Design an enzyme around this catalytic site. Sequence first.
Site, PDB file in Angstrom:
ATOM      1  N   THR B   1      11.405  39.559  47.710  1.00 46.80           N
ATOM      2  CA  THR B   1      12.161  38.618  46.841  1.00 46.80           C
ATOM      3  C   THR B   1      11.184  37.768  46.039  1.00 46.80           C
ATOM      4  O   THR B   1      10.203  37.250  46.582  1.00 46.80           O
ATOM      5  CB  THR B   1      13.111  37.726  47.657  1.00 46.80           C
ATOM      6  OG1 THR B   1      13.587  36.663  46.827  1.00 46.80           O
ATOM      7  CG2 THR B   1      12.403  37.140  48.854  1.00 46.80           C
ATOM      8  N   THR B   2      11.438  37.671  44.738  1.00 45.53           N
ATOM      9  CA  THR B   2      10.583  36.912  43.845  1.00 45.53           C
ATOM     10  C   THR B   2      11.412  36.136  42.837  1.00 45.53           C
ATOM     11  O   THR B   2      12.476  36.584  42.425  1.00 45.53           O
ATOM     12  CB  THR B   2       9.552  37.842  43.143  1.00 45.53           C
ATOM     13  OG1 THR B   2       9.187  37.301  41.867  1.00 45.53           O
ATOM     14  CG2 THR B   2      10.099  39.230  42.975  1.00 45.53           C
TER      15      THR B   2
END
Lengths: 203, 203, 224, 224, 224, 224, 224, 224, 224
Positions: B1-2
């Site tokens: 996740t970014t």
Amino acid sequence: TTTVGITLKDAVIMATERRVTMENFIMHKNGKKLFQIDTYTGMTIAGLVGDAQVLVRYMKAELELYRLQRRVNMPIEAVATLLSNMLNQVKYMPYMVQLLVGGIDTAPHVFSIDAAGGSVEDIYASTGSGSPFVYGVLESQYSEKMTVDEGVDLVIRAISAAKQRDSASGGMIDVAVITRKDGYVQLPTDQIESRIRKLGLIL
Amino acid sequence: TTTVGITLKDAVIMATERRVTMENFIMHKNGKKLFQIDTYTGMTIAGLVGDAQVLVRYMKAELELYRLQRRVNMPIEAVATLLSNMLNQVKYMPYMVQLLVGGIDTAPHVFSIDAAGGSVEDIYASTGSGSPFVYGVLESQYSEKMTVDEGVDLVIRAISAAKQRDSASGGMIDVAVITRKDGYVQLPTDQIESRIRKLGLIL
Amino acid sequence: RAITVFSPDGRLFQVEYAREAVKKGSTALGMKFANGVLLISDKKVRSRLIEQNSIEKIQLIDDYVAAVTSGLVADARVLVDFARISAQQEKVTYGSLVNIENLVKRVADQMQQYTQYGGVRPYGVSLIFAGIDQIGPRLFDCDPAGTINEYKATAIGSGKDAVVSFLEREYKENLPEKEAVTLGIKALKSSLEEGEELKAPEIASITVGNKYRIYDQEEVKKFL
Amino acid sequence: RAITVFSPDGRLFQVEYAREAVKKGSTALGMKFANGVLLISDKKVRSRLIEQNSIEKIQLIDDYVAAVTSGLVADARVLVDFARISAQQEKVTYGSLVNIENLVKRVADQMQQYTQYGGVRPYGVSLIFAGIDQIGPRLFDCDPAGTINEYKATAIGSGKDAVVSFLEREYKENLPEKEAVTLGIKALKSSLEEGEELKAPEIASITVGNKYRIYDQEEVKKFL
Amino acid sequence: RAITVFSPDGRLFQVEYAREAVKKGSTALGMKFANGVLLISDKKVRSRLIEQNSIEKIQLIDDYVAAVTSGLVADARVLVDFARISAQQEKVTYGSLVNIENLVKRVADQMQQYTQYGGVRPYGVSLIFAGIDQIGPRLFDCDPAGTINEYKATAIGSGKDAVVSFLEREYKENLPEKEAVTLGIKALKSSLEEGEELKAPEIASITVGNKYRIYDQEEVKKFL
Amino acid sequence: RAITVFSPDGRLFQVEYAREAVKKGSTALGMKFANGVLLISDKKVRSRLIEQNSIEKIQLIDDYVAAVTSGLVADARVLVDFARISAQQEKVTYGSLVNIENLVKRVADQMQQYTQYGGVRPYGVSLIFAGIDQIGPRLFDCDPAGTINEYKATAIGSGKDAVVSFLEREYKENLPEKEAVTLGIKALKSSLEEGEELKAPEIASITVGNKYRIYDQEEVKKFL
Amino acid sequence: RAITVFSPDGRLFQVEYAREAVKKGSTALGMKFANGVLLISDKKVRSRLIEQNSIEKIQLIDDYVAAVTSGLVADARVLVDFARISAQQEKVTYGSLVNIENLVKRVADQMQQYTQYGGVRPYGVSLIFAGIDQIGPRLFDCDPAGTINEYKATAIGSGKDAVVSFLEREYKENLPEKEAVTLGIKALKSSLEEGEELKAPEIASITVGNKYRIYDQEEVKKFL
Amino acid sequence: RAITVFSPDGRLFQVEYAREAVKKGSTALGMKFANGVLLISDKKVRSRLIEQNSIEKIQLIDDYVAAVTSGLVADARVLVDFARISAQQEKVTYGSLVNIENLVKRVADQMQQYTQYGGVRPYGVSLIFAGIDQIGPRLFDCDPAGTINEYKATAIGSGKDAVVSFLEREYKENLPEKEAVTLGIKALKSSLEEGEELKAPEIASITVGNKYRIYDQEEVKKFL
Amino acid sequence: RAITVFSPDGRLFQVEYAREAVKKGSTALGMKFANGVLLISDKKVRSRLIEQNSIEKIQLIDDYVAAVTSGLVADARVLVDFARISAQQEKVTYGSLVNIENLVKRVADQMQQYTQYGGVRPYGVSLIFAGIDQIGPRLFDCDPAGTINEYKATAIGSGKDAVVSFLEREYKENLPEKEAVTLGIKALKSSLEEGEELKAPEIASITVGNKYRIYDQEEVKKFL
């Protein structure tokens, strides 16, 4: 143990098998993992029996009380958020469980809830020991353009598969389809085992 | 996740991808991590879902109430601060999360907040599993003399990169750009994927 | 020199005395119309030295629900804020304030408590909540006794009896906004207008599908 | 100007004064019949501006048990909700509300407490619970004193004495629903009907084997 | 308009006023006999609409001990349940309710507390406990003052003085059950029977060696 | 209609009124003799229906210390049990109730507390403790004020003044048990014996070196 | 019928009424002498039946400090024990009761609290503490108001004014013990001796360098 | 027979009645001078039997700040100790009592609390604090109402009005210590000196740069 | 001799009596001007012995917001400090006191609480807050009832009605500071100036963009 909630057109279908075990000692052949929780909603339990059951009762009641005081049924995302709040609020001494709550208000829904109150909605999702296997076949054959009947079969298939590759799962698989037309209706055992035989599946 | 928040002239852009996974088991392809939290401000979640979600609701309601009571919107540094206090206040049984809050009051702003209530403002910053990768491209191509449109592209590029080198990130990348003129606006999915294709990127 | 207990005839005199305080309050009303509901209060001003608008009588609870109050000003304020946070509470647990009726019930119960718990003076105020919820446009009123009722149109404060009768007579079911605000302002006029000048009324409205709209000085002056 | 204590003749005057408040309440009744029980309340309305049905007097506690109340409206509401959650409580621990009698006893005790604990005014309300439990169709009534009794048929509110006497006389043991609702409505009429018009009564019923049924406007108008 | 304190002559007027309330209570009595003890209460009924037996005056505390009460009904109920759980408590710690005397003492002390702790009205009720314990058949009575005594036979409620005198005179030590219930019912009759009809008395008994037995409608009617 | 506070002349009227209650109590006395101490109470009985001995006035606190009380029966009982457990407490910590004086002091202080702590009625009772401790045979008395004194012989209840004067006159220092019980019973007689019949007195005694001895019906009748 | 509050003239009537109670107390006094201080109380006895010495008026707080009290006996006792443990407390923390003045201050403050904390009756007693501390022989007195003062010689109780005046006149600074006790007993005599007989006074003394000494029956009779 | 509430004219009668108590207090004053401030109190003594100096009216809070009080002695003492520990508190947290004004404010607030918190009598005392702080020599006074003011010179107690007027007239700004103490003693004289003899005044002073100095018997007698 | 409850006409007499206390307070006012706001209070002094400036009536809450009060001095002080810390609180959580209106609301609610919570006297004081916040220069006033309003100019204390009328008439919207302070001082004069001499007024002001400025003795004397 394996459960699955699947969304489609104008319905939501939920099914689970029902073997309850203690390590390798399969102690109970007929547990119950599928519960109606409100006129237009169901829930699937998976994890530690103690925590799940108490959790089901709280939810069941909390919902009925809500209905009466508000004169209208609680929305699905609302039930999911409520639950989410409860679980996260006690994350450090969590209800070791994994819940799947499906239902239909303005549209069909299905949410995945973890022991920390993480809540996320998908078009379908599985829960439990045999999750991977079903996610395998669902990933392979699910389509949002299916009929409620096609759905009920896909699901049975999905569960029967996990039953093969997962010793923790087993026993009679049972399903319930919930539509706005008829509401939450659980399919007749016979009819289910009928589809099994037809499909050439087993158990 | 970014996730990533970037500052430029008279706007602040914020974007995230949207895969939610349990180790290697990618369980949810479409989670949401970008949330508008006030007319002229947004927040990006990253970390343990349960904590993240509840934290978001708290922040939402708290902001709405303050607006009504004070007749004006809460300044960006102010909301950062509040969050800071809440988080730090419970450092020994923390909300394992990492928050990025951006918005525009008298000017644009973006704050990085850690689970220990540490809060710092930068001209851009990334959060999440793929942080380093995006920090790369940004450190390589971000320019404070860019236009909101160049911005949205950059952002799409950066996340796309991270998506390549980080199995924990994935899914449709979605952006929201917030300006005083139009307020907080989240770009349409098609326009986003259109830019992707145009840029020669993937997924 | 006695209490909050029952009189020999079955009445809570304290709650009655309280009601008195509200009658001496300003006059305001509201009514459901076309596809929304509107609120209107008589903003009677004195000195040139008051900060005009700052004396807002119609207050927002949240972008989709507002309320107007009458009685001991202080009591009204504190009771408003209670509803505000109480509103927020339902939002944060359930994710959405589905039924507004419920919001008023909570604040009502709050008031009902001081109706019997010994050592404490009741809330000398009445108010009405208006807004559109999951069910649709809704209109409620509440008195110091904690009694709550849903209306099609109603008023409160000083000229209640008067304005209410006008509506009781000339209220038009599905009157479109423009005409509804008119009927209202007319009704408000007649009532308190023993003193001729209507002054500058405070009016706001909301319609299903969107947030509340507070009428600007000129817009209201247009119906005035 | 004295209390909740015993008078020289052994009476709690406060609880008496309370009873007064209930007499001035609306009239309602109920009775067991064929294989269920029914409830009926006189829904006396005033303004065209009230939201009709919203003023529901017969309230549900749960799909199999309802209650109707008379007295200080506020007090009735809060006492209703108490029974509701109290009901839920028995469900969540034992898994099933087996005996309804018990539900009423709890709410009764609640009321009995304010009968002696010094600083606090008693609940100025009386109500009756009706429904079918593990034992079968059951009918109970309760007053501000916390006194509770099971009936075959009864009434409460304003015209109690009247309607009760009619039943006392013309009550028919195992009267089938249709005839039972009739006898009832007739009984309700006679009583409060000093003022001729019965208006629109509110009626609901349940029968062993299933959930409660609230009569629709037309259905009730059929017996009216 | 003063209290629970001592009068200039050494009396707790409040506790007296309380006693009044009990006199106005129904009449009941009991007595030890052969190898057990029996309880009998006058079940005076009114309307055809009451649910008969449901108005049980003789209540069980546990299979081997019952009690009957007189005074403010509400107060009696709550005080009964207290004894019930209190009974359970002794059972769960010690494994057995060895001495019944002790059970009554606890409930008595409960009542004695409200005799002096300022802000709270005393329990307006008197009752008698009967049953067979480790010591044998035992009979006790208790008043609102918390005073408790063991009897060979006694009564309480309205016609106490009367019925008690009859026994005081014609009470027969080791009267076998059949004759004992008779003497009793006769005694109960004379007393309250200024109004001729004894109606349907409620009677129950227990004998050493076994649990309590509640007399059925016909059985009691046999002595009636 | 005022309190537990000081009168303009320095007196606690409430505590006085309390004392009144004790005067109206039964008569009892005790005295030290040879090498022990004895207690004797007038057991005045009424009905044939009372369970004789069960109305024990001389109560044991522990095998070596007993006490007899006079005043509001309920108050006496509860105050007795307090001393009992209080006794046990000293035993369990120190291993032995060395000084009885201390036991009475604790119970006295208990009573003294209600003498000043506002909202609560004082203990309407007086009692005397008798027994042999580490120091030897000891005799104490205590009133509702919490005042405590050690005697050589004394009485309490109704005929205090009377019986006390007899002793005051004919009390014999080291009178051997048989003669001591006699002098006592004689003294008790004279006093309350305005009504001739002494009835059946309750008497018990203990002597240094051993536990308490309760006189049996016949033994007491022997001195009677 | 009002309180512990200030009168229109600046006085706490309750504390005054309290003072009254102490005047009606026995008479006692003390004074510093040679190299110590002595205490003497009039032990006025009644019945032959009282246990003589047991009615000790001069009580020890610890081997080096004693106190004598006057007023409501019960109040005096409890206030004594407080000082006793309070004394122990200073010993256990600091290792030594260095300044006695401090001991009295604590007990004084205790009394001062009931002078203003609403619901509670003040301590109806006055007392004097005497002993030798780190500073030397010290003499203090304390009243129900919590007022405390150090003396060279003083008295308290009934004949205060009298005895005090005698000393005020014939008090001799550094009078050696034998002569000091004499002057004292003489002073005590004159005062209360309107009734001729001094009876048996209770006297004790301590001198710097050692513990307290209680005079034996014969020794005191020697000065008598 | 009513309270601590507002009279129809806006006054706290209780606090007034309190003020009365202080007027009846001894007289004392103080004033700033050269480079310090001094305090002086009239030490009016009675009996030869009082321990002279022990009746210290000027008390130290800490080596650099003292205070003198007037009113109910008990109340004054307890309020003094509060300031003492309160002083210590500021020292231990901040490391230094920088502003004395603050010390008085805390003790003032303490007193102000009893001015409104219902059930509790106000502090019947006034006092003045004097000393040199970070800011320099400072002089404050405080009344039972919690009102506090800084002076150049002032007095309190009985002869306030008098002595204050003298100063009001003959007060000399920067009067050097010797002359300042004189002016003071002269001022104190005139006032209370309706009774001629000034007796033995108690005087102490401090000057910037060092600790407080209490004047010795002879030194004060020098100005006397 | 009754309360904080509603009179038969709907009024809190206690809060009224409180208002009285404030009228008897000093006179002060303030008004918005050019690009700031100013505060001015009449500093009426008595004795030469008071420490001049120390009697500061205009107090700072923080460098950008000040307030001036009128009524019971003690009550004003404590209520000021509350606002001060309350101010600090908003600063530490949010990082900035964005809306001053909010600060006053909190302190107002504090006062409103004592308006109904039984046992406690209301705050006998009114005050006005002035300063520049995120919104700009702001002016508020608050009474003992907890009522709060924003002004363009206003006054409080003794000569309110007077000074307010002058402004009501001659108040000039955007008057530049120099002229504004003048108009003010003129207005203050007229009002309280029945007694001719204006004495030495206390004046301070702040202007958008910077902190508050307190006028020095000479500067104010310049307008005087």
